[PDB]
């Protein structure tokens, strides 16, 4: 019984510490935060999943900069359940800045075909070309959003291979290099001098780890408190 | 209240980010234009937005939905690669370049169309001299529609037999993908070269 009471004190302490860390991080990087006012009474906060970058984890950290540029602005896109939710958010959510919302029920994208990756692999070598989506981990319920952000672009090792893959007539697919050069088969190239400072993705990850541990402890404590209440 | 404090952090951060990104964009463009003027890099035109004009009524719309207005038009991807190398070697910054030769695929694709609720197609509102540049604008804008408000946008985007890309006069966007863009007090404007 006292062990349960001590466990409750321990969980409460960790939760307090984690919330403080969470708030410190948001203060240091306010772009990591997405806030909105409930657009309705009895608002199900589960309808809003959050910023794309808060919902993924990089599998291959050598591709961190490439993945950052694959997404671009879409790291800060907001994933929600429906376009209905999205409209309410835009209208009634009191957003403090401009956001692009991804509605899971409507979002649509042409994923890279297996045959297309095949061709790219034979063209530049399977070590040197990957579908961006294969390099991020995320919960399955977010599949359609992540296909949209990462499933339509290749990540290649260097500019020469990226160019060869992007503009191959059998492929015609957006490609990004490890250095963050972006080839669009429509006929554009984006690149230049990029900072070697830590990718914003590392900061999202650092915040995600805190959010994840916080969620587990808050759930642990809620359950423990339910049962403590039951002793009476 | 902590949400009030963080709202202020966020606003401060947005101001800082806008300032920095606007200066960086201007710095990169001026560097590229010096390479054009000096003749050290041939085949550079300039930013796409300087090559078109649009009625002031649509200033916010096209400024909000056409990132390509800040792309730098050059003759080819080869010249784009020379520019990107230049930017890297002198640690100047980043830009997006349009290979104008790639734009020719749109040459016969620009004819006027019937649109949902007879909304204007934004591309048709852009006044251009050169036909190659007009092709670049079609690349940039395609069949983007202008709606009067977000309700009409949702109607023309989602509710027809087909999906359409639509921007509102206030600068909100619905993409063919399904995404919806808006929020905040900050308005994008002035990204087109004139108001002819």
From Swiss-Prot, chain A:
The modification N6-acetyllysine is found at residue 203. It comes from the Eukaryota. It is found in: Nucleus; Cytoplasm; Chromosome. Residues 48-166 form the SMC hinge domain. The SMC hinge domain, which separates the large intramolecular coiled coil regions, allows the heterodimerization with SMC4, forming a V-shaped heterodimer. Forms a heterodimer with SMC4. Component of the condensin complex, which contains the SMC2 and SMC4 heterodimer, and three non SMC subunits that probably regulate the complex: BRRN1/CAPH, CNAP1/CAPD2 and CAPG. Interacts with BRD4 (isoform B), leading to insulate chromatin from DNA damage response pathway. Belongs to the SMC family. SMC2 subfamily. Central component of the condensin complex, a complex required for conversion of interphase chromatin into mitotic-like condense chromosomes. The condensin complex probably introduces positive supercoils into relaxed DNA in the presence of type I topoisomerases and converts nicked DNA into positive knotted forms in the presence of type II topoisomerases. This is Structural maintenance of chromosomes protein 2. The lineage of its organism: Eukaryota, Metazoa, Chordata, Craniata, Vertebrata. The gene is SMC2. The chain holds residues 476 to 706 of 1197 of the full protein.
From Swiss-Prot, chain B:
Widely expressed. Higher expression in testis, colon, thymus. It is found in: Nucleus; Cytoplasm; Chromosome. The modification N6-acetyllysine is found at residue 108. Residues 42-156 form the SMC hinge domain. Forms a heterodimer with SMC2. Component of the condensin complex, which contains the SMC2 and SMC4 heterodimer, and three non SMC subunits that probably regulate the complex: BRRN1/CAPH, CNAP1/CAPD2 and CAPG. Belongs to the SMC family. SMC4 subfamily. The SMC hinge domain, which separates the large intramolecular coiled coil regions, allows the heterodimerization with SMC2, forming a V-shaped heterodimer. Central component of the condensin complex, a complex required for conversion of interphase chromatin into mitotic-like condense chromosomes. The condensin complex probably introduces positive supercoils into relaxed DNA in the presence of type I topoisomerases and converts nicked DNA into positive knotted forms in the presence of type II topoisomerases. This is Structural maintenance of chromosomes protein 4. It comes from Homo sapiens (Human). The gene is SMC4. The chain holds residues 572 to 767 of 1288 of the full protein.
């Amino acid at each position: 019984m006292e062990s349960l009471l001590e466990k409750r004190r321990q969980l409460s302490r960790d939760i307090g510490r984690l919330k403080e860390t969470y708030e410190a991080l948001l203060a240091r990087f306010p772009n990591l935060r997405f806030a909105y006012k409930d657009p309705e009474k009895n608002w199900n906060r589960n309808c809003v999943k959050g910023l794309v970058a808060s919902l993924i984890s990089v599998k291959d950290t050598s591709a961190t900069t490439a993945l950052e540029l694959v997404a671009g602005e879409r790291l800060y896109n907001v994933v929600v359940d429906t376009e209905v939710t999205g409209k309410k958010l835009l209208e009634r959510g009191e957003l403090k800045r401009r956001y692009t919302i991804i509605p899971l029920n409507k979002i649509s994208a042409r994923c890279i075909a297996p045959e297309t990756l095949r061709v790219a692999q034979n063209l530049v070598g399977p070590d040197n070309v990957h579908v961006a989506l294969s390099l991020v981990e995320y919960k399955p319920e977010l599949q359609k959003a992540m296909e949209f952000v990462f499933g339509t672009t290749f990540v290649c090792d260097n500019m020469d291979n990226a160019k060869k893959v992007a503009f191959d007539k059998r492929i015609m697919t957006r490609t990004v290099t490890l250095g963050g050069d972006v080839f669009d088969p429509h006929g554009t190239l984006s690149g230049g001098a990029r900072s070697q400072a830590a990718s914003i993705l590392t900061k999202f990850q650092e915040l995600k780890d805190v959010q994840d541990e916080l969620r587990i402890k808050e759930n642990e404590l809620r359950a423990l408190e339910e049962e403590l209440a039951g002793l009476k | 209240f902590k949400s009030l404090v963080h709202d202020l952090f966020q606003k401060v951060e947005e101001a800082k980010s806008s300032l920095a990104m606007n200066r960086s964009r201007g710095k990169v463009l001026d560097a590229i234009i010096q390479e054009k003027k000096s003749g050290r890099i041939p085949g550079i035109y300039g930013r796409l937005g300087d090559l078109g004009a649009i009625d002031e009524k649509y200033d916010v719309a096209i400024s909000s939905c056409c990132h390509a207005l800040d792309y730098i038009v050059v003759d080819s991807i080869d010249i784009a690669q020379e520019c990107v190398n230049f930017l890297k070697r002198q640690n100047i910054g980043v830009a997006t370049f349009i290979g104008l030769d790639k734009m020719a695929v749109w040459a016969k694709k620009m004819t006027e169309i019937q649109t949902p609720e007879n909304t204007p197609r934004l591309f048709d509102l852009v006044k251009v001299k050169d036909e190659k540049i007009r092709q670049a604008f079609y690349f940039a804008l395609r069949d983007t529609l202008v709606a009067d408000n977000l309700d009409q946008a949702t109607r023309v985007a989602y509710q027809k037999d087909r999906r359409w890309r639509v921007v509102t006069l206030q600068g909100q966007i619905i993409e063919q993908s399904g995404t919806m863009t808006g929020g905040g007090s900050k308005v994008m404007k002035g990204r087109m070269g004139s108001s002819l």
